[PDB]
Amino acid sequence: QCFLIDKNFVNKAVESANLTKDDVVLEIGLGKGILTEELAKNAKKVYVIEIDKSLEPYANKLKELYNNIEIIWGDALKVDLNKLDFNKVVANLPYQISSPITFKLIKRGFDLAVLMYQYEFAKRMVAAAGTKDYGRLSVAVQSRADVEIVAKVPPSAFYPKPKVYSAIVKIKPNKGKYHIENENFFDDFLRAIFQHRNKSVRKALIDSSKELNYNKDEMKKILEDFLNTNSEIKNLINEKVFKLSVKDIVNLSNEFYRFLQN
Ligand SMILES: Nc1ncnc2c1ncn2[C@@H]1O[C@H](CO)[C@@H](O)[C@H]1O
User: Fold this and answer.
1) End-to-end alpha-carbon separation of the chain, Å?
2) For the chain, how are helix, strand and coil distributed in percent, rounded to 5?
3) Residue 213 phi/psi, 5° resolution?
4) For S-adenosyl-L-methionine, which residues are the binding ones?
5) Is the shortest distance between the CB of 92 and ligand 1 below 6 Å?
6) Is 50 annotated as a binding residue?
7) Is there a binding annotation on residue 29?
């Protein structure tokens, strides 16, 4: 249990969330309620999902001062987020749940999130194409949202003191930017190519053909056929996986899905 104890980083997170009294905020983790209090002050209402019932006295004290806090006791990975009406998410995330929670939240949808991650995880999220930290996580996030690191957060800001830095990350979903033909196929396509990130897209797809439910020979012939559709496709699939931009991977998988359909 890491608790964010530096009010200055609370402030930075809240300021970045651009809150008004029309906003409804989901917070993951109660902690000592320091972030919770700031959210309650500035938002219409705050939902807090907290797993540890020993923290109830913090919740209880807060609810005496604020009438717009609702506590949900449970695991945030299990809570049905469809049943909650919020537009923003602000949280010092338990790092253990970083990846699954991020995608469950984006799936549900929101206007804006400002979330604490471990610094290396944050770097991967925001990494530019063709760089050393660019990978599946980068494309999976950036294809669905604009993301940026607001601030690096030192271990001294938490208690107990962590081993590594954290980072505040701002996430603005953008449902219109890249346009995805089929989410399931896109997820499988991403999983296949990034299993071989230093190979050409062509070779990655053949090596990991079973992820897309084709055999290796089938996949070879498919890609021979696919490459002959246009010159843009040829140059994309011949390029190393990690060098393709998010835009290019989305378009490529879109064109590939339709090719496989037709
Ligand atoms: N899976 C989880 N769901 C909800 N809250 C959690 C989970 N794991 C840890 N927490 C809580 O989040 C906070 C981490 O800062 C702590 O209050 C901790 O109890």
Assistant:
1) 51
2) 50, 20, 30
3) 65, 40
4) 4, 29, 50, 75, 92
5) yes
6) yes
7) yes
**Sign of torsion over alpha carbons 199, 201, 203, 206:** positive
Q: Ligand 1 centroid to 117 CA: how many Å? A: 13
Residues in CB range of 184: below 8 A, 6 or more apart: none
- 215 burial level (CB within 10 Å; 0-12, 13-18, 19+): exposed
Q: Which of 177, 193, 223 is the last residue of a domain?
A: 177
Give me the number of domains the chain comprises. Answer: 2
Q: Is 50 in the pocket of ligand 1 (CB under 6 A)?
A: yes
Q: How many CB atoms lie within 10 A of CB 218?
A: 13
Query: How many angstroms separate the alpha carbon of residue 15 from the centre of ligand 1?
Result: 23
77 and 194 inside one domain: no
Which domain does 208 fall in, by range?
178-262
Same domain, residue pair 135 and 232: no
Atom 17 (ligand 1): residue with closest C-alpha? Answer: 31
126 plus 86 within the same structural domain: yes
Q: What is the resolution of this structure in A?
A: 1.9
Whether 73 and 8 share a structural domain: yes
* Integer CA distances (angstroms), 112 to 58, 131, 134, 219, in order: 26, 26, 23, 40
Q: Are 145 and 178 in contact (CB under 8 A)?
A: no
Q: Choose the residue to mutate in 2, 28, 89 for probing ligand 1, maximizing ligand atoms within 8 Å of C-beta.
A: 28
Q: Experimental method used, please? A: X-ray
